[PDB]
């Protein structure tokens, strides 16, 4: 068991107010946990309108990483 | 370094070092291609560098071990840092072999005298600091934190203007 | 050879080797990333590679000087040539290492014809030409004009598919 839990570090609430706050929190929660269905799409990303000399570092170490990255 | 570099690991330099080892058998050894291999790998690379000054910095030492010269983006030291070309000792060495001979305590009390006089004065942090050699001079406890802050500045460091081409050629 | 390549001046491999030089000192010298290195270089090399063999391509040495294997772009050798894994004494040496009696007339007879039918049918061009290992066995005296016809048509070599990145690690 290595979860962090909420602690009620000072305070002995009865179950009612137990209940009543952990009903509240829960209410209170961020909503869904993270957006998962987030996808990659590429279209136009910034660092293809940049003008990179043809000779330019950038090229491999912003442009190509950047499309590479996963 | 090379290492690091291709897979994008800031590097962080402790330094406490008087230099290359002198001695015959170094030179044989190869010790001026080597820390020539040092000093390139330390310039090549492209990621985050970051210095902490921990004593001394003499010489090759404090160049190779990520001087700002050689393109380290941030550099403290701690107050206890020696930043010279040379140590005290060398440097009183290089000075009384220029007498006759230690002919008498006369030359001790010149060597101690010049030995205080150049630890006081210039294997310091201060000369350094006051040409902006090395961004701060920090007190000790403030490492930690200091490193989480100039790492995440240096996030996203892009190195240049440099010029693309098949390979830098090292030393060998 | 990464001079060569850096400044883009097609490499013409030369060959007579035994391979790597045996022994302790050689070892402690660090024969081992020497060679490393040696390897590295000669596969990162996007210029023309083109080999003459003359006789001894022994083990590492044939594998090092500008082999097929390692991306070398055309393979000649003369009727002298000798491609082996190991020299034909050594290969004796550890025939004999088996039923050691090395002071009796019949382990030298057998010796004697094991180097003879060795340098016969095994350290000669004939296998690698037949396995397509080089791309031909010449008279020496066609060697000018056809590194000549080679390297014309090597002039526009394109080296790939190659991933583009930092660059390239190498045993140091």
């Not at chain 2, 406890?141 to 081409?165: A, F, I, W, Y």
Request: one cysteine or more; glycine letters at 8%.
């Amino acid at each position: 068991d290595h979860e962090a839990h909420i602690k009620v570090l000072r305070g002995e609430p009865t179950p009612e107010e137990m209940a009543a706050l952990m009903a509240v929190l829960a209410s209170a929660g961020g909503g869904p946990a993270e957006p998962v269905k987030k996808e990659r799409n590429m279209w136009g990303h910034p660092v293809d309108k940049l003008r990179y000399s043809v000779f330019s570092w950038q090229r491999v170490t912003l442009l190509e990483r950047t499309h590479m990255r996963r | 370094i090379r290492f690091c570099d291709s897979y994008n690991l800031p590097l962080v330099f402790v330094v406490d070092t008087p230099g290359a080892m002198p001695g015959v058998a170094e030179e044989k050894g190869g010790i001026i291609k080597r820390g020539g291999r040092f000093f390139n790998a330390i310039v090549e690379a492209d990621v985050p560098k970051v210095t902490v000054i921990i004593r001394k910095a003499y010489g090759g030492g404090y160049a190779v071990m990520g001087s700002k010269q050689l393109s380290a983006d941030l550099n403290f030291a701690w107050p206890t840092a020696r930043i010279a070309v040379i140590g005290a000792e060398g440097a009183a060495q290089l000075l009384v072999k220029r007498f006759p001979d230690p002919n008498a305590p006369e030359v001790q009390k010149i060597r101690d005298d010049f030995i205080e006089g150049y630890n006081l004065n210039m294997a310091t942090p201060w000369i350094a600091a006051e040409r902006g050699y090395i961004d701060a001079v920090i007190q000790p406890h403030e490492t930690r934190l200091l490193l989480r802050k100039s790492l995440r500045l240096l996030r996203d460091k892009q190195n240049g203007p440099k010029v693309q081409r098949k390979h830098g050629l090292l030393p060998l």
